[PDB]
Amino acid sequence: GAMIESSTTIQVISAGLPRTGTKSLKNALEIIYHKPCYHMFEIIFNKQSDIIKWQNLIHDSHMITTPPPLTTKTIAIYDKLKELLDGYIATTDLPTCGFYKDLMNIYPNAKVLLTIRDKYDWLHSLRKVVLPKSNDPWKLKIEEGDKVLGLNSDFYKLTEDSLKFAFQKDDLNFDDDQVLLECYDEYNRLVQETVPSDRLLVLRLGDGWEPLCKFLNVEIPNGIDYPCVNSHHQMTQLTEQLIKYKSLDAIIHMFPDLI
Ligand SMILES: O=[N+]([O-])c1cc(N[C@H]2CCN(Cc3ccc(OC(F)(F)F)cc3)C2)ccc1CO
Ligand SMILES: Nc1ncnc2c1ncn2[C@@H]1O[C@H](COP(=O)(O)O)[C@@H](OP(=O)(O)O)[C@H]1O
Predict the structure, then answer these.
(1) 69: Cβ below 6 Å to ligand 2?
(2) CB within 8 A of 241, min separation 6: which ones?
(3) Which of 27, 104, 108, 255 lies at a 20 to 30 A Cα distance from 199?
(4) Whose CA is nearest to atom 6 of ligand 1?
């Protein structure tokens, strides 16, 4: 196809939850658009200063009144969300995904994705990477590796609070598998009930380039396979290597596309 000059603004809002292919989608969107896509890894690697800003935004998010129409308090909140996302062409992952309805208002010409997968595979992946149970010894290795990156309790607070916001819960028993599974199913159901189908594409792990590129009116990137990154096995290796070498920069060349 012809090359066209794309606008550097949010063009794709992905409502999918963590551990549903968000990093592969981030990479895929950057391959298509040649500009950055937001993801938790963007916070970790480039924008740790944004942690407190997302936390403040979630703390105030209860004061959003669902437009239309648009109130003054909502506008203040929307301006800070637009500020956080300046320079990016898409959103994925926590902390953004729970804001999908508000992002649709701010970027009315953006299209919406939902990444989904088997609920038990999701929970297993989540327990291995994001939210190990309190008495799981792996949780201590996770925390040891994360300190190497400069991640502290405020990082974990943002994950917890952005998950609570996505699930619209005032509190959450993070160690309760039944609660998390029900929240996952209800969240994915609600996205599909809220977003007009003309503006939504539901992606399953393995769908690849074709449905995504058709939805976005772009050619399939030639000779580039659809990304497959961020498996829990890979994350386990990264945590262990962070622990062993005590720096990211010592090991970064061993994780090329993930990072
Ligand atoms: O949904 N979350 O908020 C969310 C939380 C976490 N959690 C923490 C706790 C386990 N810890 C291990 C870890 C993981 C990735 C790393 O990757 C890199 F350094 F960025 F490359 C380094 C260390 C990271 C991970 C991903 C996400 C969402 O994508
Ligand atoms: N192209 C692909 N095909 C199949 N699975 C994929 C994939 N890209 C990512 N995944 C899976 O998506 C999960 C990561 O999602 P996220 O990037 O949102 O954290 C991982 O699941 P597992 O942990 O079950 O391996 C990873 O293996």
Answers:
(1) no
(2) 251, 254
(3) 27
(4) 130
- Tell me how far apart the alpha carbons of residues 21 and 7 are, in angstroms, rounded to a whole number: 25
| CA dist., res. 64 & res. 68, Å (int) | 11
Under CATH, which number does the domain 1-259 receive?
3.40.50.300
Structure tokens at 87: 């320079």
Ligand 1 within 6 A of CB of 18: yes
3-state DSSP call for residue 103?
Answer: helix
Tokens of 231: 């498996």
- For 68, half-sphere exposure in the C-beta direction (CA atoms, 13 angstrom radius) is 1
Q: Which phi and psi (to 5°) does residue 201 adopt?
A: -120, 120
Ligand nearest to the CA of 125: 2
Separation CA 97–CA 165 (nearest Å): 9
Q: Which of 251, 257, 228, 227 is nearest to 238 (CA)?
A: 251
Q: Which residues, including other chains, have CB under 8 Å from residue 145's CB and lie 6 or more apart?
A: 238, 239, 240, 242, 243
Candidate from 14, 27, 40 with most ligand 1 atoms within 8 A of CB, to mutate: 40
Atom of ligand 1 nearest to the CA of 259: 21
Domain positions in the chain are 1-259
Which two structure tokens, joined as six digits, stand for 77? 């909140």
